[PDB]
Nucleic acid binder design. Structure first.
Ligand code: K
Ligand code: MG
Ligand code: MG
Ligand code: MG
Ligand code: MG
Ligand code: MG
Ligand code: MG
Ligand code: MG
Ligand code: MG
Ligand code: MG
Ligand code: MG
Ligand code: MG
Ligand code: MG
Ligand code: MG
Ligand code: MG
Ligand code: MG
Ligand code: MG
Ligand code: MG
Ligand code: MG
Ligand code: MG
Ligand code: MG
Ligand code: MG
Ligand code: MG
Ligand code: MG
Ligand code: MG
Ligand code: MG
Ligand code: MG
Ligand code: MG
Ligand code: MG
Ligand code: MG
Ligand code: MG
Ligand code: MG
Ligand code: MG
Ligand code: MG
Ligand code: MG
Ligand code: MG
Length: 72
RNA sequence: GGUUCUCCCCGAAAGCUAUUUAGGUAGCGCCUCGUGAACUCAUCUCCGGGGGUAGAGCACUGUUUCGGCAAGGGGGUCA
């Protein structure tokens, strides 16, 4: 084996999605994120457990129990 | 507002629900890729079903025009 002749296993490497590089790329102009809206914007997207202003599942359900000191 | 090379396969939605929500967002529904599974699924034929729509009708709910039957009544007449 030479330093050139080495090569990786097939399927190991996968290039990567490069957004905004023409029509032919596929993704390109709106880099796979649609037209307008909060999610299209830079630094967009809502925080975790946010259901559009509806009271979230992790708040409409009651909280229960106590963490045991002895179990630790 | 703009988001820069190329070819191959599949290919939506503009609905429901909720929202200080309504040009935003979230779960489901529809798109995709992956992994599993039964004759699963569609079509047609023949069965077993529940409708109470279209249409129709007037016993009931109401409405409606005649004719008949008139209880009930409106005007008159007395000592
Ligand atoms: K509908
Ligand atoms: Mg390779
Ligand atoms: Mg490649
Ligand atoms: Mg490289
Ligand atoms: Mg990288
Ligand atoms: Mg890039
Ligand atoms: Mg692509
Ligand atoms: Mg595209
Ligand atoms: Mg995307
Ligand atoms: Mg745009
Ligand atoms: Mg829009
Ligand atoms: Mg969007
Ligand atoms: Mg920014
Ligand atoms: Mg931000
Ligand atoms: Mg407590
Ligand atoms: Mg096609
Ligand atoms: Mg509800
Ligand atoms: Mg509603
Ligand atoms: Mg909306
Ligand atoms: Mg808005
Ligand atoms: Mg599939
Ligand atoms: Mg796996
Ligand atoms: Mg069968
Ligand atoms: Mg089944
Ligand atoms: Mg069948
Ligand atoms: Mg039959
Ligand atoms: Mg039958
Ligand atoms: Mg029947
Ligand atoms: Mg009818
Ligand atoms: Mg009718
Ligand atoms: Mg009859
Ligand atoms: Mg009759
Ligand atoms: Mg009735
Ligand atoms: Mg009545
Ligand atoms: Mg009548
Ligand atoms: Mg009459």
């Amino acid at each position: 084996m030479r330093l050139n002749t080495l090569s990786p296993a097939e399927g190991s490497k996968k290039a990567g999605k490069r957004l905004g590089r023409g029509i032919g790329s596929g993704l390109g102009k709106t880099g796979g994120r649609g037209h307008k809206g909060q999610k299209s914007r830079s630094g967009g997207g809502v925080r975790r457990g946010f259901e559009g202003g509806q009271m979230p599942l992790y708040r409409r359900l009651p909280k229960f129990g106590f963490t045991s000191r002895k179990a630790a």
